[PDB]
Amino acid sequence: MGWAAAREAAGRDMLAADLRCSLFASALQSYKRDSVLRPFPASYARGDCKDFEALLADASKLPNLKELLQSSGDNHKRAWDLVSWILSSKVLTIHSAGKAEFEKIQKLTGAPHTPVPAPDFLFEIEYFDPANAKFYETKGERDLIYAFHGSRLENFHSIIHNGLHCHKTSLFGEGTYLTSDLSLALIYSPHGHGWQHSLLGPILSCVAVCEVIDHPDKYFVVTNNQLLRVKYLLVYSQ
Numbered sequence: 001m002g003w004a005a006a007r008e009a010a011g012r013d014m015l016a017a018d019l020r021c022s023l024f025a026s027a028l029q030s031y032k033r034d035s036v037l038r039p040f041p042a043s044y045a046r047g048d049c050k051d052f053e054a055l056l057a058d059a060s061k062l063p064n065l066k067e068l069l070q071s072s073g074d075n076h077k078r079a080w081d082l083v084s085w086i087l088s089s090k091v092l093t094i095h096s097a098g099k100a101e102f103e104k105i106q107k108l109t110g111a112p113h114t115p116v117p118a119p120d121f122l123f124e125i126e127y128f129d130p131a132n133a134k135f136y137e138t139k140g141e142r143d144l145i146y147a148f149h150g151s152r153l154e155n156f157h158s159i160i161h162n163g164l165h166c167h168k169t170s171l172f173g174e175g176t177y178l179t180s181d182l183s184l185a186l187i188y189s190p191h192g193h194g195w196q197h198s199l200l201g202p203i204l205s206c207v208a209v210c211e212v213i214d215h216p217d218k219y220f221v222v223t224n225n226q227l228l229r230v231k232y233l234l235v236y237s238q
């Protein structure tokens with residue numbers, strides 16, 4: 001939450017820090033920013049009134065993270081307040097994974113079935129307690145299944161903080177679409193605009209790898225949000 005703690009977080013894992021900045025930039029740029037940029041930095045809201053022009057303005061003046069970490073403020077207070085906000089969570093963290101990691105995800109999802117591309121970047125999501133212990137409690141003796149969910153890039157800031165995919169709900173039969181076949185997930189992950197100063201590249205596509213408690217529920221739909229969580233992000237840079 002502080003400048004000193006963000007500097008440390010960004011330092012450990014640049015790519016994870018950059019992914020968060022990129023997903024923020026994607027949600028903020030979107031014409032759907034009001035709906036997709038949730039959570040929204042409180043410092044840019046009077047009441048329920050979101051200062052999007054002030055936000056777009058400060059986000060566009062952000063240097064890349066190597067440049068930010070070489071500055072240490074103090075005239076760059078706005079940049080650090082925003083980046084420190086982007087990098088904050090008491091619920092979870094994002095970590096960089098290798099590419100021998102894709103082999104692990106392909107093992108958990110089985111034989112690729114359809115030929116598909118390897119992600120350019122891989123990220124693992126760590127959940128904190130109570131939620132992480134609660135998840136395994138709900139799991140019990142049941143085994144964990146791994147399936148994919150693709151989405152437009154402007155939706156992953158929200159997916160990573162609120163999960164898939166929240167329930168005003170209003171309609172019946174609502175739930176998350178999953179598939180063991182990444183090729184099917186990928187057609188729902190088109191390239192979207194990221195961040196111009198990203199180490200990942202400015203145009204990205206992102207697929208979620210979901211950890212599902214095996215319960216009675218080619219693709220399938222999970223109606224109970226308590227029995228799944230996002231565990232990995234597969235990032236492709238155009």
Ligand SMILES: NC(=O)c1cccc(N)c1
Pocket residue numbers: 148149150151177178179184185186188219220
């Ligand atoms: N959004 C998705 O990644 C997905 C996966 C399986 C089936 C469908 N309709 C969608």
